[PDB]
Design a binder for this molecule. Structure first.
Ligand SMILES: Nc1ncnc2c1ncn2[C@@H]1O[C@H](COP(=O)(O)OP(=O)(O)OP(O)(O)=S)[C@@H](O)[C@H]1O
Ligand SMILES: Nc1ncnc2c1ncn2[C@@H]1O[C@H](COP(=O)(O)OP(=O)(O)OP(O)(O)=S)[C@@H](O)[C@H]1O
Ligand SMILES: Nc1ncnc2c1ncn2[C@@H]1O[C@H](COP(=O)(O)OP(=O)(O)OP(O)(O)=S)[C@@H](O)[C@H]1O
Ligand SMILES: [Mg+2]
Ligand SMILES: [Mg+2]
Ligand SMILES: [Mg+2]
Lengths: 327, 282, 319, 439
DNA sequence: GATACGAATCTTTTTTTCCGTATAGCCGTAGC
DNA sequence: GCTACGGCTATACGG
DNA sequence: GATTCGTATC
């Protein structure tokens, strides 16, 4: 019943060739498998980069039918304390293989949430029973892992998804769901994805839901911005132009009108203005400092909440004061 | 402050069994117990002050001799004693007759912290072996005794169920019904059911349900009555039901549960009351 | 089929002569092995520089045939509670095993830094009771985790970080044993990425050979990444804010490094940053701490890191 | 074949590395404790590891026990690893004490508790407390002398939780014994100090000349003096010094001499942060080593309070108010970082930089003190009890719900004044709650 | 006799795991 | 031959 | 680490 599933858990890759983006890691692990030697892998990267899918497809490729007993997967949902590591992991990586020979695979999903004592006990299991067992460690934060564990694990870095991988996955989704996507909407979707496939899948599902009749109807950038509630680039450019050139009253009026036209959030406008101003050429190096600092505290205050109009006026005043240094 | 009493188990069986059951119950409930020696009755109290309270009344005619004298009102001598020492003394005295004897158990208050000189005899087979014991107790003050009172029970929604006597045909079946919920290891709350006669033991949880029901004949002495209580108190209720023929169950809607046990000595009747608060709300 | 031991364990040294690095310490271990009178010792240092293998080789050359029932290797993977220490260590120490006149039983306690304090006191009692028949060897990362009374009876040996020359020698031995193609630039890149870790060097070399074959700088830097502490140090030491921002973005944000990792690395680098003033160092520490608090509270965007870099540059160039 | 610290153990009192005053006031206490009616019941010895605490008691028992023993020599040491079949673990020490209580007349033997039972488990720690409390309060007409030696060591961090207790941080007599045991009339405490350089040098020289042939064979005899001085300078542990000397002598190469590193005390760390450390002019290196070696003490709110309390003792308070304002502002800023390591690092670095910039020769500093925050907490607890009493009497004789906020603001001073005139001119509470406010 | 050295003082009340005890359940043997 | 009770053991709790 | 008082040694 794959039609009764969210799009994120509907297009999970089943084979290694279905994982896009991380070509180097996929080729390296495939060479490892074909050569017959697999070290203690360690997968590191931002969420949604395809670490769990890659390791699951790798385990399926290695053990086609014996995946149930040749693979032991533990994650943050199960207790992974000192006792679990001492007993269950040792018992799994202490017995002989059933009939598949090869080696036993132990996957530690989100190992950054494990305690330090658990990792200290796990390092000796890893370096002791490595003849017949290989460990895989998946984590988004490397600072929460013991340096010895990183030392005994071969580190693989999962980069954020490039453009072409997003295009290929979106094309596959469109072919499967019989959907149409405008190139402008395609560009908008990749920009908001931020190297995340789950965000792309969720936004595509929401856009298909947004259409009154899914077939014979294209998904435009307007549909994307209406479904996800993000400001259009034209709105951001107009707001920045009004703040930079116009006086205070009309800039405030323009910001209020732009925000009230579609119900836009101030934090999204702040992120858009930050992204646009990064492309600007500033010749003072004090405008950069003022902009970054003032916008950082404004974003933090928005994260803690407060008066929204005061925060918007603060954004306008901060930008104006920072650009007064460029004289 | 002159307290002295003599107990003969073989002379009067029923009241000695009542005393032994009270001692066992107060020992199983919690450590230490309150012995209130009023001039006409002895009350054994186990006050944890949610957890239940046991209020057993023992008449003065139970013991062969009941000299109780103190400067307080109605010669009220109140004392706190460890149940384990008293339980061990009572087990020794019970084994004394079990091996064959009829000797009396003499108890005197020999000296605020005092001790009872519980001494009795035993004869193996025509030898004299004197068993002497001294259980350290503390003497509760008069105001501290006044701070302990039996909790009154409202009768606005309280409904009585006359549980069948265990000596009858339905007594063993009802005992099995009561202990049917005790064989589950992972049970902490029992939610009772009475609609207006049926007694239903319902244990509802996240992923399992239990519907023990009593289909036998029952009497209510003379409307839904639900109260959820802990399993440990239900064990005490089951233990009390086995040792008492006249057992009365009172259920209050979302307020409390009362387990009344009575021993018809007729003569003043010995009664045991176990007040149980609801563990949580319906 | 898949049967091939990883090069980390396939080439684990079995004798003290194959251990590179601390030449003086290895020579002392050889002298102890040839003498026999091994005292209580504590071995500490960075991970993967040859602490566990040195102790195992010393025990093997000190007992030989009696290694099967003359050593007791307990680690963090095994239970090491006060009851376990009591029972097992007392029974092993009391055991009367006949040995050469200069030979003693060895109790190898790997990962001794993760042992409970009550077990440490039990170890004190066992050492004071049975020091004439058995000896205790401690392997740890830092000696501070072992209590002072335990360290009082032990001869502390400190393992320094492996030099580039010793790592190169062991690596070249492995190339000559495996007969794989290599380039001097590739070996230099492997050493540079290893950062004094021998196990990391072996893992990176094995991955490079198994993924690309010939070991050059291009393949190595295409499979493994440059150490992010060095990238963070370069970012913090930039002159102007634009270069630091560009380095931060294109080397930590486009590469897929978490912001909390960047903040922790910046804190460590600032703690170990030379050629800077104390006031500047403490101001950057305070700024990194404020950024760390903001990241922990939930605001983990690139804007916070950019603001941290801007404030660091503002304090660097003053006002 | 044997360890040097074991084969060269003292045979008499003259070979024990101990100060003359320490030997004298331990001898006097032990001799007084062997009297038929001894004022002191037990003897408590505290100090760092390898401070001749255990051995001096043995050599004293070799000369005191045979003298006071009746007619019809060593200590009766508790052994914790003994596992008896019918003995629960918490009852082992109780059984040991009950058995050792029968050592008074014609069976006299000193009792030496060198290794205590497992005190890191709370139940047996409380059992130990109430077991040694009963010994001091025992109604026994005469008891054998009891000697307890506790090694003052810092327990390293093992598990991550903010329910860390006193025993979890450091292993000292204060964390083990409570206030009742320590402040007892029948308890005598003799704290110990690390062995000085002079005794260490003398004993290392004696050990060296006891093995003269082996150092002369390895040509290390000419270099033995500098090794002895350097070892005595580095550490104060006699066992560690002898072990290091044996390791150096048995060596055949140029291996550098290393010894165990002693932890830095609380007031030692306070002085290091305030006045700096000699032989280390780099503040960054000193702070980094202090944080790496003593992170347990540094990562505590007690240390920041100690700095705030003792930063005015740099020159008896004779420094610019700008420096004090900067220090207290930095401490207030660090208090808002929720205990991050960066907060402690920044605070210590700023304090050290501030005190380094104004440092001058000839400065006469003051004496540092522990923070008084615990006294303030105790006074607040007393105020809470008195306010609870006031609210109880005000809610029992009549119906009046007043908030504790109003009790502290106005009712803590106005209401006692009302009850004063009302009573003298003619309710229960007449004095100001928490006492009067002075200055 | 001047000085280096040494002693005394400057002090305290959520989460995971582990160590030992409590307790209920079940099996084996004495007695009715 | 059957039941009761004491001893042994596995599991939850507590600090 | 700092201050203050008391000894042993040069
Ligand atoms: N490279 C990829 N190719 C195709 N689909 C992908 C890729 N990366 C992610 N996805 C999709 O995103 C979903 C979630 O990715 P996962 O790999 O399960 O999670 P993850 O990448 O490990 O991130 P974290 O760190 O575990 S939250 C997958 O089920 C796929 O549908
Ligand atoms: N000096 C060395 N010479 C040769 N191989 C070495 C050396 N040091 C480490 N290795 C290799 O490192 C691997 C095992 O190193 P270990 O000694 O177990 O690590 P470690 O030094 O004990 O650090 P930790 O704290 O235990 S993670 C094996 O593959 C060894 O060949
Ligand atoms: N001259 C000496 N003076 C003192 N101890 C000596 C001497 N020569 C050898 N030793 C040994 O040095 C060791 C010192 O141990 P102690 O200090 O007596 O024990 P301790 O005080 O309890 O230290 P901890 O806390 O148990 S590690 C003993 O094993 C002595 O035998
Ligand atoms: Mg995942
Ligand atoms: Mg190791
Ligand atoms: Mg000792």
């Amino acid at each position: 019943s794959k039609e009764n599933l969210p799009w994120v858990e509907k297009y999970r890759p089943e084979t290694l060739d279905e994982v896009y983006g991380q070509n180097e890691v996929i080729t390296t692990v495939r060479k490892f498998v074909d050569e017959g030697k697999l070290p203690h892998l360690l997968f590191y990267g931002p969420p949604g980069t395809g670490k769990t899918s890659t390791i699951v497809a790798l385990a399926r490729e290695i053990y086609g039918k014996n995946y149930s007993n040749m693979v032991l997967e533990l994650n943050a949902s199960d207790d992974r304390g000192i006792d679990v590591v001492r007993n269950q992991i040792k018992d799994f990586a202490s017995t002989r293989q059933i009939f598949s020979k090869g080696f036993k695979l132990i996957i530690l999903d989100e190992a950054d949430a494990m305690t330090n004592a658990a990792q200290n006990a796990l390092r000796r299991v890893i370096e002791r029973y490595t003849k017949n067992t290989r460990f895989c460690v998946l984590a988004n934060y490397a600072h929460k892992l013991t340096p010895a564990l990183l030392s005994r694990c071969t580190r693989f870095r999962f980069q954020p998804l490039p453009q072409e991988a997003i295009e290929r996955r979106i094309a596959n989704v469109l072919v499967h769901e019989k959907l149409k996507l405008s190139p402008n909407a395609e560009k908008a979707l990749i920009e908001l994805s931020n190297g995340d496939m789950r965000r792309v899948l969720n936004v595509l599902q929401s856009c298909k839901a947004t259409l009154d009749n899914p077939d014979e109807d294209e998904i435009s950038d307007d549909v994307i911005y209406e479904c996800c509630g993000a400001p259009r680039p034209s709105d951001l450019k107009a707001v920045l132009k009004s703040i930079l050139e116009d006086d205070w009253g009309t800039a405030h009026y323009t910001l209020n009108k732009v925000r009230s036209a579609k119900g836009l959030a101030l934090i999204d406008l702040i992120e858009g203005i930050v992204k646009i101003l990064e492309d600007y050429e500033l010749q003072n190096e004090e405008t950069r400092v003022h902009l970054l600092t003032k916008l950082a505290d404004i974003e933090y205050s928005i994260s803690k909440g407060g008066n929204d109009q005061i925060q918007g006026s603060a954004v306008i005043g901060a930008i104006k004061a920072s650009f007064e240094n460029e004289t | 402050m002159k307290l002295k009493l003599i107990v003969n188990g073989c002379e009067a069986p029923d009241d000695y069994k009542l005393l032994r059951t009270t001692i066992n119950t107060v020992a199983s409930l919690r450590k230490t117990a309150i012995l209130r020696f009023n001039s006409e009755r002895l009350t054994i109290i186990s006050t944890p002050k949610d957890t239940g309270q046991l209020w057993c009344t023992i008449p003065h005619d139970v013991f062969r001799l009941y000299t109780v004298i103190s400067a307080r009102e109605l010669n009220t001598i109140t004392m706190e004693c460890n149940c384990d020492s008293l339980l061990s003394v009572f087990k020794r005295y019970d084994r004394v007759m079990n091996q064959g004897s009829s000797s009396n158990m003499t108890i005197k208050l020999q000296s605020p912290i005092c001790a009872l000189g519980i001494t009795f005899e035993e004869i193996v087979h025509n030898k004299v072996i004197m068993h002497s014991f001294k259980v350290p107790v503390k003497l509760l003050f008069r105001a501290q005794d006044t701070r302990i009172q039996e909790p009154m029970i409202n009768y606005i929604q309280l409904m009585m169920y006359k549980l069948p006597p265990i000596s009858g045909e339905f007594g063993s079946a009802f005992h099995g019904f009561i202990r049917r919920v005790e064989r589950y290891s992972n049970v902490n709350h029992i939610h009772l059911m009475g609609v207006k006669v049926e007694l239903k033991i319902i244990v509802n949880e996240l992923d399992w349900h239990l519907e023990i029901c009593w289909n036998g004949p029952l009497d209510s002495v003379i409307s839904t009555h639900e109260v959820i209580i802990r399993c440990k108190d239900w064990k005490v209720c089951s233990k009390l039901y086995a040792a008492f023929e006249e057992v009365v169950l009172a259920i209050s809607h979302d307020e409390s549960c009362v387990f009344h046990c009575s021993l018809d000595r007729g003569r003043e009747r010995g009664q045991i009351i176990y007040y149980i608060a609801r563990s949580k709300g319906l | 089929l898949s049967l091939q031991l990883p090069w980390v364990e396939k080439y684990r040294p079995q004798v003290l002569s194959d251990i590179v690095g601390n030449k003086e310490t290895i020579d002392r271990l050889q002298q102890i092995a040839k003498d026999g009178n091994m005292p209580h010792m504590i071995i500490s240092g960075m991970p993967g520089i040859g602490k566990t293998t040195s102790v195992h080789c010393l025990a093997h050359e000190l007992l030989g045939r009696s290694y099967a029932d003359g050593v007791l290797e307990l680690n963090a993977s095994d239970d090491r509670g006060i009851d376990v220490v009591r029972n097992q260590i007392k029974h092993f120490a009391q055991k009367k095993l006949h040995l050469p006149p200069g030979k003693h039983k060895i109790v190898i306690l790997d990962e001794a830094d993760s042992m409970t304090a009550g077990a440490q006191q039990a170890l004190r009692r066992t050492m004071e009771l049975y020091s004439n028949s058995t000896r205790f060897a401690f392997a740890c990362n830092q000696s501070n985790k072992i209590i002072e009374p335990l360290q009082s009876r032990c001869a502390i040996l400190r393992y320094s970080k492996l030099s580039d020359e010793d790592v190169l020698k062991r690596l070249l031995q492995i190339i000559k044993l495996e007969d794989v193609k290599y380039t001097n630039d590739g070996l230099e890149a492997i050493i540079f990425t290893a950062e004094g870790d021998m196990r990391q060097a072996i893992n990176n070399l094995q991955s490079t050979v198994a993924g690309h074959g010939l070991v050059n700088a291009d393949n190595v830097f295409k499979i493994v990444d440059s150490p992010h502490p060095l990238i963070v140090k370069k970012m913090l030491l930039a002159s102007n804010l634009e270069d630091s921002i560009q380095i931060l973005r294109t080397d930590l944000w486009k590469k897929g490094y978490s912001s909390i990792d960047i903040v922790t690395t910046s804190f460590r680098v600032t703690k170990n940053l030379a050629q800077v003033k104390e006031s500047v160092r403490l101001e950057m520490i305070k700024e990194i701490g404020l950024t760390h608090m903001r990241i922990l509270e939930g605001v983990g965007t690139y804007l916070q890191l950019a603001s941290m870099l801007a404030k660091i540059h503002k304090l660097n160039n003053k006002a | 074949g044997e360890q040097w610290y074991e084969k060269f153990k003292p045979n008499c009192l003259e070979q024990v590395a101990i100060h003359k005053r320490k030997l004298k006031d331990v001898q006097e206490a032990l001799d007084a404790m062997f009297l038929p009616n001894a004022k002191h019941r037990i003897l408590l010895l505290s100090g760092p590891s390898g401070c001749s605490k255990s051995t001096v008691i043995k050599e004293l028992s070799k000369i005191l026990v045979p003298k006071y023993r009746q007619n019809s020599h060593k200590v009766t040491e508790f052994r914790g690893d003994c596992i008896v079949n019918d003995l629960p673990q918490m009852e082992s020490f109780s059984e040991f004490l009950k058995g050792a209580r029968y050592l008074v007349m014609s069976n006299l033997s000193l009792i030496l508790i060198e290794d205590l039972p497992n005190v890191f488990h709370i139940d047996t720690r409380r059992r130990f407390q109430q077991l040694i409390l009963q010994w001091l309060y025992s109604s026994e007409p005469l008891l054998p002398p009891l000697v307890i030696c506790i090694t003052e060591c810092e327990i390293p961090e093992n598990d991550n939780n903010y329910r860390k207790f006193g025993i979890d941080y450091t292993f000292s007599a204060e964390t083990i014994m409570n206030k009742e045991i320590l402040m007892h009339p029948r308890l005598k405490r003799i704290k110990f100090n690390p062995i000085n350089s002079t005794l260490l040098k003398k004993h290392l020289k004696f050990i060296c000349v006891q093995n003269m042939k082996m150092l002369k064979e390895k040509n290390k005899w000419n270099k033995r003096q500098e090794v002895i001085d350097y070892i005595a300078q580095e550490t104060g542990d006699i066992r560690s010094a002898i072990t290091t000397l044996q390791f150096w002598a048995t060596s055949s190469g140029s291996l550098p001499i290393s010894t165990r590193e002693s932890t830095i005390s609380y007031f030692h760390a306070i002085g290091k942060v305030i006045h700096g450390s000699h032989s280390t002019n780099n503040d960054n290196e000193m702070i980094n080593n202090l944080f790496e070696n003593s992170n347990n003490l540094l990562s505590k709110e007690d240390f920041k309070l100690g700095i705030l309390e003792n930063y005015n003792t740099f020159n008896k308070g004779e420094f610019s108010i700008s420096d004090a304002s900067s220090i207290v502002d930095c401490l207030s800023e660090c208090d808002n970082m929720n205990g991050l390591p960066e907060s402690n690092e920044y605070g210590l670095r700023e304090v050290r930089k501030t005190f380094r910039n104004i440092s001058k020769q000839g400065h006469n500093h003051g004496t540092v003190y522990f923070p008084r925050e615990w006294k303030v907490r105790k006074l607040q607890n007393s105020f809470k009890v008195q306010a609870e009493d006031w609210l109880n009497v005000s809610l029992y004789k009549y119906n009046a719900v007043h908030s504790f906020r109003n009790i502290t603001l106005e009712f803590g001073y106005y209401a006692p004044l009302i009850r004063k005139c009302q009573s003298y001119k003619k309710i229960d509470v007449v004095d100001r709650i928490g006492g009067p406010i002075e200055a």
